[PDB]
Design a protein around this ligand. Structure first.
Ligand SMILES: [Cl-]
Ligand code: NA
Length: 129
């Protein structure tokens, strides 16, 4: 599923991401835009052989099991394919674990490079929340 901007913002807000660990909604929407272009089916392979999955590009090196990343962990306790669902619940619940791990949203490279320190409220502007 390819989300619209405001559609995703409302889904995220409903799933408890607004101000989660102090990150306003615009941060999460911005991250999703640059990580996946709002496509829940996005996958991207890393150099180390791990793979990023879904709207928030969650890495199989640490967070999910894809059966093909030897010596990895499964900290979110889910198959990585669950992160590609049109239902964002699993991605959001795993994101909450990631963002609480000490390093905040800096875990997401695109957020650090493209959202951090910008006017992220522009990402929810006009939306019916
Ligand atoms: Cl933080
Ligand atoms: Na694993």
């Amino acid at each position: 599923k390819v989300f619209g901007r405001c559609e995703l913002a409302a889904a995220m807000k409903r799933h408890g991401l607004d101000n989660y660990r102090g990150y306003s909604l615009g941060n999460w929407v911005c991250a999703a835009k640059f990580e996946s272009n709002f496509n829940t089916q996005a996958t991207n392979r890393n150099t180390d052989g791990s793979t990023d999955y879904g709207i928030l590009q969650i890495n199989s090196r640490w967070w999910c099991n894809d059966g093909r990343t030897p010596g990895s962990r499964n900290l979110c306790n889910i198959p990585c394919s669950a992160l590609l669902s049109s239902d964002i619940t699993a991605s959001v619940n795993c994101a909450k674990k990631i963002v609480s791990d000490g390093n905040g949203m800096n875990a997401w490279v695109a957020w650090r490079n493209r959202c951090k320190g910008t006017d992220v409220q522009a990402w929810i502007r006009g939306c019916r929340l």
